[PDB]
Amino acid sequence: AYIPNAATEDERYYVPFTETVASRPLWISPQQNRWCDILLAREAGLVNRHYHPHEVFAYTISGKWGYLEHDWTATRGDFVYETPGEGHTLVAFEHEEPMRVFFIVQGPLIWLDEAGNSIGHFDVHDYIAMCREHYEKVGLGADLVVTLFR
Amino acid sequence: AYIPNAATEDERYYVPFTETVASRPLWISPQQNRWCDILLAREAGLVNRHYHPHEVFAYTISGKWGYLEHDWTATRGDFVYETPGEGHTLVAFEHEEPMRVFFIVQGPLIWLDEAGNSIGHFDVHDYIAMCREHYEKVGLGADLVVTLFR
Ligand SMILES: [Fe+3]
Ligand SMILES: [Fe+3]
């Protein structure tokens, strides 16, 4: 698979995930419960506390972001590996550029509690569904998502 | 793990792989036989034909490169997924910028024949050895490699 201009300026390609953060799917494996994507926050953003059962890798393209549970913040060019089992809250700061991050995500995400409990999930089927749905609405066609399968 | 400025200009961090192509290790898993790295070619470059038993993901940072066995060439911003089992020859063109590519590699690589045979291998132990060795020589210390383990 070859996707030119992955972190495109074309807003249509980005699927809302939370209210402030969206992603462009690049590669999805329903069988492996795994996906690559560009994570985008045009403004201040937050992704709720969750943990992955497995690793996460990120390479930062632009903006400034990090997780509240570590001391670093990542800007253009910085690499991040999250250790499996880590509960974390992603945040994005307002920077000259939107936040854009290349991610390889081995799902599910388990949403965590204010407390510390499992309170919801996000797996690859949830991801395929939201992306198909958005791509139908914006006129990229639901079937463009199917093009990303492997 | 957080590595600032992964695709650094500091040449010392890059470990020669072929004569024209080098990589900076970013994350290495001896147990999973898997690693992330920045692949760099300052000039024209070539990596000999080989196949991975598993997937490869790449996000292109700068330069222009591709595989002889596909029709695309990848420049700044382009994403690539190589399907597992694919035999391929990586090439890098001379561009305004060096080639720099963020890779997640599930090894081993099996070197292939002019013909089409398995004729050599490259696994994570080979990678750890070459990186330790180079990092000792350049004065980043062999032990900096151990810092990359997970
Ligand atoms: Fe996460
Ligand atoms: Fe390869």
Side-chain angles (χ1 to χ4, degrees):
Chain A
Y2 159 75
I3 300 181
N5 191 22
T8 174
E9 305 276 8
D10 188 353
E11 195 61 32
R12 288 188 302 157
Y13 289 89
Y14 293 92
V15 179
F17 177 66
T18 69
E19 284 213 21
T20 48
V21 182
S23 69
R24 177 181 183 181
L26 293 171
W27 176 90
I28 301 175
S29 182
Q31 208 224 59
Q32 301 158 44
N33 197 9
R34 186 153 74 119
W35 63 88
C36 309
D37 65 60
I38 307 293
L39 200 63
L40 164 76
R42 303 253 171 205
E43 293 314 338
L46 172 126
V47 173
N48 311 249
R49 187 150 156 250
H50 52 277
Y51 79 85
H52 316 245
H54 331 254
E55 22 264 288
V56 169
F57 305 89
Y59 170 82
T60 303
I61 293 161
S62 76
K64 168 156 157 167
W65 66 285
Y67 294 108
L68 299 185
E69 298 75 5
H70 307 303
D71 52 357
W72 50 262
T73 56
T75 44
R76 175 184 309 281
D78 293 354
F79 166 76
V80 172
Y81 166 68
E82 275 310 280
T83 200
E86 250 270 316
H88 64 201
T89 310
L90 191 151
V91 297
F93 296 79
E94 281 181 28
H95 201 251
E96 193 179 18
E97 288 260 70
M99 175 198 70
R100 301 175 179 102
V101 187
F102 176 60
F103 267 99
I104 318 208
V105 178
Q106 178 53 76
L109 284 67
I110 309 307
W111 302 111
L112 290 178
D113 237 329
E114 270 279 71
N117 296 296
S118 291
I119 91 208
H121 67 286
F122 189 85
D123 59 36
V124 66
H125 307 288
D126 298 310
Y127 189 40
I128 288 163
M130 77 173 23
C131 292
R132 281 190 50 96
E133 214 270 349
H134 184 76
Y135 278 27
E136 268 306 304
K137 281 132 93 255
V138 291
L140 288 169
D143 279 339
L144 172 43
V145 185
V146 167
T147 261
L148 303 172
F149 290 3
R150 266 121 200 151
Chain B
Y2 159 75
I3 300 181
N5 191 22
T8 174
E9 305 276 8
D10 188 353
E11 195 61 32
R12 288 188 302 157
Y13 289 89
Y14 293 92
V15 179
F17 177 66
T18 69
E19 284 213 21
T20 48
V21 182
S23 69
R24 177 181 183 181
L26 293 171
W27 176 90
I28 301 175
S29 182
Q31 208 224 59
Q32 301 158 44
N33 197 9
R34 186 153 74 119
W35 63 88
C36 309
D37 65 60
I38 307 293
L39 200 63
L40 164 76
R42 303 253 171 205
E43 293 314 338
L46 172 126
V47 173
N48 311 249
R49 187 150 156 250
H50 52 277
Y51 79 85
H52 316 245
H54 331 254
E55 22 264 288
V56 169
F57 305 89
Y59 170 82
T60 303
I61 293 161
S62 76
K64 168 156 157 167
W65 66 285
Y67 294 108
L68 299 185
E69 298 75 5
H70 307 303
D71 52 357
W72 50 262
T73 56
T75 44
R76 175 184 309 281
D78 293 354
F79 166 76
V80 172
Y81 166 68
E82 275 310 280
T83 200
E86 250 270 316
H88 64 201
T89 310
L90 191 151
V91 297
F93 296 79
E94 281 181 28
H95 201 251
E96 193 179 18
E97 288 260 70
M99 175 198 70
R100 301 175 179 102
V101 187
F102 176 60
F103 267 99
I104 318 208
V105 178
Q106 178 53 76
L109 284 67
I110 309 307
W111 302 111
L112 290 178
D113 237 329
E114 270 279 71
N117 296 296
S118 291
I119 91 208
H121 67 286
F122 189 85
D123 59 36
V124 66
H125 307 288
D126 298 310
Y127 189 40
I128 288 163
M130 76 173 23
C131 292
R132 281 190 50 96
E133 214 270 349
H134 184 76
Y135 278 27
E136 268 306 304
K137 281 132 93 255
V138 291
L140 288 169
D143 279 339
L144 172 43
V145 185
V146 167
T147 261
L148 303 172
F149 290 3
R150 266 121 200 151

